[PDB]
Amino acid sequence: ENLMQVYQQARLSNPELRKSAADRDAAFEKINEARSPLLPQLGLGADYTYSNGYRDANGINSNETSASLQLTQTLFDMSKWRGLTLQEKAAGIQDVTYQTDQQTLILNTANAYFKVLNAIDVLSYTQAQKEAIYRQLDQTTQRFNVGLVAITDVQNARAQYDTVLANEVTARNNLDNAVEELRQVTGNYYPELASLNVEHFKTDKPKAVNALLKEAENRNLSLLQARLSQDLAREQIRQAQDGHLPTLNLTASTGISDTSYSGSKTNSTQYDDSNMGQNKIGLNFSLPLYQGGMVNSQVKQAQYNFVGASEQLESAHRSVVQTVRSSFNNINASISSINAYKQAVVSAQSSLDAMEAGYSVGTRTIVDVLDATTTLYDAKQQLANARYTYLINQLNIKYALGTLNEQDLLALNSTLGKPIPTSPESV
Amino acid sequence: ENLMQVYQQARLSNPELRKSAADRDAAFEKINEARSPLLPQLGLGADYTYSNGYRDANGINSNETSASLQLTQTLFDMSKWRGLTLQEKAAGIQDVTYQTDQQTLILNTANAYFKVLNAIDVLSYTQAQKEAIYRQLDQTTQRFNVGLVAITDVQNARAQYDTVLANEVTARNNLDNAVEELRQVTGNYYPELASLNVEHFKTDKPKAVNALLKEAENRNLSLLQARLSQDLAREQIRQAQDGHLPTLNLTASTGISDTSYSGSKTNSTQYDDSNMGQNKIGLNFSLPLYQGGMVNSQVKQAQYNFVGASEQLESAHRSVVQTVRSSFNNINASISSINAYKQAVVSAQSSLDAMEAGYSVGTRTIVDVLDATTTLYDAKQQLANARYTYLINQLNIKYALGTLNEQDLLALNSTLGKPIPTSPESVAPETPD
């Protein structure tokens, strides 16, 4: 019904947010795959060889039926140990990516919700303007049929009356495409929503912009993720750097191998029936000294990328400054506009009342009276819309601060009210 | 010239679409690469080594040589079998992408083509308006040069002329840039096209919206794709799962060897010239027991990706319902606008006539006659557009239902009549103004 309920429905099922979670889940899951090369590697092998001879070996055949039980255990691989915390970091970037997506859904739903509401008001005023213009056309028509007004007055009215009728068409189509926006976001169709309580509508000027900036610094999400994506780039310098380092591998094994032989070749105590069993343990030290200049090159790029991710951060800061500062401007302009269009509506109404009392003694005409109606319901339109802009602007500030949430929608119920249906608000 | 014939000219050489064709062609070609590890691997290899013992092997100097054939045909290797049927899926997906593109080029030619006409109508009507203003200015200067009207009726009229004159410089430019956009779509410049036949024009009610949805639900190319990618992701679970399974390789070699020792402690019969030839047939078998928790971690990743692809499916669905329902609404709001602007042009006209008669007997002024001229050629414009919006929205549906077709472009030259041009009509700088 109202916005909170609509969102609570929407978070329950919305693809874009769930698909974001699945990415976060996998990104956290993949840590275990990053840890695995540091854990015991155990395998089983089995061989069936067979031989022959045809030169010096003048036809010594044989065979094998071998079997292993191989173990690997890295005791010191720094590149491997580094690859784990890279994937842990990667999971962090994805979790911040996800929280960013939780706020986008709120904003997207609020907008979708207030787009529909606003669309209803544009249709209501269009209908109202239409009935106001039609009143004039109908009345002027009656006066004309008894010769009290010229034919011209009637033909000017009918013209303006048909402009609006076409306008109403667009407006009822726009409302019906707004509800379709909201159906795609929420996953549901709503015949009625909570209207805006116009009486209960107040305005609160925002916090100081330097205060808003000082906080955004701490809690903006695009900004934190940036500080994490850069930190990851730094760790990749080291993984590349760990190419200069040696490694140590424990490798234990156990196996059996029984062996046969053949025709007319040779003989003992040279060879035969064997049934070799053997257990093995081993430490493989292995250290790169110079492999083509690769490791130095891989560090350089990892560094250029770090320098690059350093730039994406300042970029992410400048966008936070732009958005916070421009959201401050925008909410202040909304409060200035609401107070403007309010005033406007009043004088638009009093000027219309003047046009009509003017039309009725000669100083004005039907075109003026009609033109007075159009400006009246345009002021009326623009006012109502400003209120919706102001609410959305309260939310965009919250978004820029990276602190948008359930409670900000919950708070918005103070200004909502009576249920309104969708077209027909006929006809 | 007309819409059918322009599309054909675009279809044959559109670089966007042929780029897709390559992507398709290549993605099918790779199947023969996804099969390659499941076939006889034959490799020939020779070498040469020299040794030199210098510790307790002082005076031991080998000098070897080898050849071989190799063969490592694989017998049971499920992952390779998998990646083959995977690459197949990747191609089937890539193809549906291509089939979508063919439908996108039909659509984007349709729009580009109708955008040009819309751009001419707007220029025709703005030019028309401009001369409707010029007659009232001209005849007013006449009435003034002999003193039948005051000069203020001349200077008021001159203004409205100049704001429409500017209005025309834009409407002109937009027709240029429309023909240029069209050229980008179809590689070609067009000096004239087939106009919309206003008289041979009729508007039909569309099918019921719930019928279109289920139609769209079974035919939508965007939808089909998302299903095959969810299905694809489903498979990659099973691929990740075959990491618990064992491999069974068949091997076989055939290689000479001539090792001939040298040195000072090559005295015994360990040293001599051995020329061991050989002929092998192997059966290597591998089966992993535990890899630090990898294969399970890989599977759990593959399952989250399946949820992902499953949610990408829902997205594709919600986007079709939005597209079908909205494109339904606009058909019904085009029809209503075509009817409402037809009526608005009748009224905006008759008003202008009474405005003039009114001006003529002093109950209105020139600034009313001119004001009514504007709302008229604004209604002619709003009307012409409602037609094109209807036709355009009619194609948006059939695209959403995955059945956008040449048959439909053909079925649109059943409303295209007399050819009209696309460049100047026509700068008239006198000046009076």
Added chain:
Amino acid sequence: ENLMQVYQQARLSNPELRKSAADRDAAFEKINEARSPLLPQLGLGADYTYSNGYRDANGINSNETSASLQLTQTLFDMSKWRGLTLQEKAAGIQDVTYQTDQQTLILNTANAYFKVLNAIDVLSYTQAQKEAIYRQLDQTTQRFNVGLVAITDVQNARAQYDTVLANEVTARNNLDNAVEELRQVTGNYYPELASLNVEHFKTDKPKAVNALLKEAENRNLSLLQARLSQDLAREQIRQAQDGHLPTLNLTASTGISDTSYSGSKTNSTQYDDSNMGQNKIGLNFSLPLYQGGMVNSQVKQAQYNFVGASEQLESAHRSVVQTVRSSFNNINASISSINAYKQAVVSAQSSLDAMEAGYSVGTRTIVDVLDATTTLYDAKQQLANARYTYLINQLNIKYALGTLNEQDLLALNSTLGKPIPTSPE
């Protein structure tokens, strides 16, 4: 303060560019990592495998120590000689992508600059319109309070006034936001900038469209990129075909090996207990004969990924042709518009006079005068806008041709001059 100076402060700091500079730098660097396999590989390993025994070979317990400087050097591997150039080409593709970023910054900085400038004018005229309407509301408020007009005149002006007040709020806000958007691109807040000099302002007709198209063909970075990338795709065809070739490989190694048996039946020959010092050296030859039609499949793909890279050029060509031709159209319609509005302002001012005249005698009413004010400070707003669009459109052409640089901004300094503040009023 002016566009040259502002862009200078923007070129030095702007992060989008500076990152792209670190992406060029790191594709040319990676040339070194493409070359490394043609160069001597050297390692060092210290084996230690203790080995126990059981079943038929029971009681025989060795344990080995080992060290060995390993060395590799490719003698012949063509697709290692080919992966290198393939990474020099991709580097060259980066450098062009960088050069495109250089010009975008110029266009961004210019577009941002003039948006603030034009935002100032719109706000300025809006206020001119406001004070203009206020006078009319004011003097006929007086003429009402002494019976010289009816209340209808006051209330008409009083309403059209309020429309402008509302408008002024938006116009002021737009300027505030427009400045912040300049602060992004630049990293600076600018109190005042060099305003456009409109007395000195002149419009030169462009070159011929066919000269621009011929010019674009040779110098437009989006085309050059597409060419280098197709030439990249061609070189990936040869890399695919390179799978049919032999692989010569020198290797060498010094090494040692302490072994020491310990146990029961430590009594025979074919196994040894040595301390070898091997100085192995030798050539290695590898040649594929057949791999399940892999290489052939990888060539038909590379060939398809070349008609792909080729059709992808006709796309890039149809794009530049559009941006060269349409932006030529746009600049011609700019010159036209600037002229049409120059007139429109002139004729709408003559008309505003004619209304205030007709009002004083009864041919035109209070609304007639007001509406003429509205038209006047709308022709002027439009005349002002048109001049900036023309200016940007000059750059959009230098952009399409792919030859946009500093000097084009330098040119846009004879056109600037007197400073104007960027806030109230």
